[PDB]
Amino acid sequence: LVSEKEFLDLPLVSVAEIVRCRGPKVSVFPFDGTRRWFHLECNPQYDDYQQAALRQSIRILKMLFEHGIETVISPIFSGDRYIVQALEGMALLANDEEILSFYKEHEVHVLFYGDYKKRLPSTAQGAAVVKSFDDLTISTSSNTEHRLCFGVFGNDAAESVAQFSISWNETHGKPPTRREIIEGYYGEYVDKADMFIGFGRFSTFDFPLLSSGKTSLYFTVAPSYYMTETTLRRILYDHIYLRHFRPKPDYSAMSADQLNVLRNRYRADRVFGVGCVHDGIWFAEG
Amino acid sequence: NLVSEKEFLDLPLVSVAEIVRCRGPKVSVFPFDGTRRWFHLECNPQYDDYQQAALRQSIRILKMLFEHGIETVISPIFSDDLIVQALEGMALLANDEEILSFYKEHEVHVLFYGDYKKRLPSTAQGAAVVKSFDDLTISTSSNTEHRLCFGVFGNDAAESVAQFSISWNETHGKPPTRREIIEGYYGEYVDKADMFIGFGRFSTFDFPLLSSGKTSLYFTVAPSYYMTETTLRRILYDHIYLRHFRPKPDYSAMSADQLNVLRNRYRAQPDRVFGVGCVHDGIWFAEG
């Protein structure tokens, strides 16, 4: 029984306790539109993309964890032979000092999911990235306050599940349960996503097995890196108090006039996700 | 392909259907949602019958979708991630004269997917309904104009996939490919969903294996049954012409002002988020 203004005025710790009580326990947050943001808020002539971007990802993950969210799932990647570059960008997640300090300071256990072992190049660099992912999962394994799952080619889990399940049944004598399948794919058991925060065109991606009809979807207008505290709070408020508001509507107990308002509104077309294009850029209308 | 929204709206139906056939959405997911509300608003709950009304509207809409050139419609009917009443409803979908007449007239091939075999009552009635699903799939298998996939507890395919894959390896000596996994789950190979049209609260559900980042998501304000021809055309237009506009943005090639309009927009309206709603009399509505 909290209003939005009240929720906005709460001290941070109260918000965190509410989130631990009611969720979202598992939040999906790809960092999207990093391109556009980099051209708008940095200097592309002087600044370097990878470091700036990493700084912002750190800021947002910090914010999410500090709001009492236990697990963040963050799909990162899904010319050519600029692959060296992008393998270095992946490498930052396991070697950059600032982010390692972040994992330490916030007691984050980092896990990687997806088809990266087979899809990454069979080069010494590719092998090095994979090995640094493995090693990072091991060296953060003593952390238990938060879980961060990074998705690298984490889009089509069907074949991976098929093979995991064949092996499992061969060594256990029965199929793996859903929990066991999830543990196999993410490394540890993770609950279904409570929310997905996307950007721009309405679409979701790269959290196999964890999607449900109870996953709340949001789409920012600005690139993810513009995410402010106020915004995160309006999202949290919507998911916690409004998405599953009780009691459910009782149409029979509604006056003739209320029913008239609903009837008239629905009769006189409005659909979220229908957009417009300006200078080659899509914007949601409304 | 240089077509405006007004132009697209003014096109003859066959032109639209041909465009949809050419450019998609080939596979469209469309649950019928907000049906209690729709029924209390557009029918006489005191005189009218719920199921006939609802079925009539579902037929109307599926008809509209197929008439717009969409090959496959996937429609979650009963969802357990979102018995109780309807083992009955699905029975209607495989047994009601009007809808059977619809599958015939519109040459629809019907499939059922989900955990229904295990979730349906283990009674003779449950068995009979399952058999009628099977029989309907066989019966409409010669229909080739359209495909309709009904979701009955079609969430959480993981365990189904595990079991299918175990059996498959037992018979073939190797794991099934993705294609084979999809055939196993849906009965036939189906491509990834090109769009999902939902209602109200932004959420999607019950099309396992077929979701991708390329699935365009839409959320109507009104309950599904209010869907009109114009609304559907606006959705189609957005998906075909706007969602994947070419060329894609080249920021380094953009003028100072092209960057400025964007920067200014984001800085001057910093908290804009679609999916945040408001509640009145227990009804959630998206803001914006």
Swiss-Prot record, chain A:
A molecular function (GO) term: phosphatase activity
The effect annotated for Y82F is:
Decrease in TOH production and almost loss of iso-TOH production. Almost loss of TOH and TOH production
Q: Which UniProt keywords apply?
A: Transferase, Virulence
Top class in the EC scheme:
transferase
Activity: how regulated: Inhibited by the bisphosphonate inhibitor BPH-629.
Q: What is the effect of changing Y49F?
A: Strong decrease in TOH and iso-TOH production. Almost loss of TOH and TOH production
Database matches in InterPro entries: UPP_synth-like_sf (IPR036424)
UniProt cofactor(s): Mg(2+)
Q: EC number(s) on record?
A: 2.5.1.153
Q: Which GO terms describe its biological process?
A: diterpenoid biosynthetic process; tuberculosinol biosynthetic process
**What is reported when this gene is inactivated?**
Deletion of the gene abolishes 1-TbAd biosynthesis and decreases the formation of swollen phagosomes.
Q: How does activity depend on pH?
A: Optimum pH is 7. It is active in a pH range of 5.5-9.0.
Q: Which reaction does it catalyse?
A: tuberculosinyl diphosphate + adenosine + H(+) = 1-tuberculosinyladenosine + diphosphate; tuberculosinyl diphosphate + H2O = tuberculosinol + diphosphate; tuberculosinyl diphosphate + H2O = (13R)-edaxadiene + diphosphate; tuberculosinyl diphosphate + H2O = (13S)-edaxadiene + diphosphate
Temperature and activity = Optimum temperature is 45 degrees Celsius. No activity is detected above 50 degrees Celsius.
Free-text cofactor note: Can also use Fe(2+), Cu(2+), Mn(2+), Zn(2+) and Ni(2+).
Q: How does it assemble?
A: Homodimer.
Q: Beyond the main fields, what else does the record say? A: 1-TbAd is highly prevalent among patient-derived M.tuberculosis strains, where it is among the most abundant lipids produced.
Function per UniProt: Tuberculosinyl transferase that catalyzes the condensation of adenosine and tuberculosinyl diphosphate (TbPP) to generate 1-tuberculosinyladenosine (1-TbAd), which acts as an antiacid that directly protects M.tuberculosis from acid pH and physically remodels M.tuberculosis phagolysosomes. In addition, acts as a phosphatase that catalyzes the diphosphate-removal from TbPP to produce both tuberculosinol (TOH) and isotuberculosinol (iso-TOH). Has broad substrate specificity, and can also use the 3 labdadienyl diphosphates, copalyl diphosphate (CDP), ent-CDP and syn-CDP in vitro.
Family membership = Belongs to the diterpene synthase family.
Query: What is the name attached to this protein's record?
Result: Tuberculosinyl adenosine transferase
Specify the species.
Mycobacterium tuberculosis (strain ATCC 25618 / H37Rv)
